[PDB]
Design a protein around this nucleic acid. Sequence first.
DNA 1: TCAGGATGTATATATCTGACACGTGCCTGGAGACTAGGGAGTAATCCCCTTGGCGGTTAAAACGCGGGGGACAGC
Length: 62
Amino acid sequence: LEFEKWAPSLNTIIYKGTPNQRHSLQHQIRVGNFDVLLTTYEYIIKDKSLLSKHDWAHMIID
DNA sequence: TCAGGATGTATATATCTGACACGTGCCTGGAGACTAGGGAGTAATCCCCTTGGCGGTTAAAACGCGGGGGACAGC
């Protein structure tokens, strides 16, 4: 909500729900096509083979 | 389903023995007294592992449901 509210032009990526949704998503960002990735603890663990693979410029943990 | 009969089983009576109960003498194995020392009890610490619950996902359990193959009764 706050990402949208406070900023436009940010390709905000989120993880949630089913693996089907997460799969179609990973396709979208399989090349790093995003400005910011928002996710959670369970997905950075469960999808670490994808998320640790992708390099990071900056990480914020709330 | 019922009475007769043949067989078999059971039951009282001797009777007979050899296997069990009992007496006796011996002797060694168990009890008593005593000593040492080390194993076990007991206290104090500590810290690792167990337990109780929750969060979150997802494979698996549950459930219905049709239908064909085996269980089973008969002969």
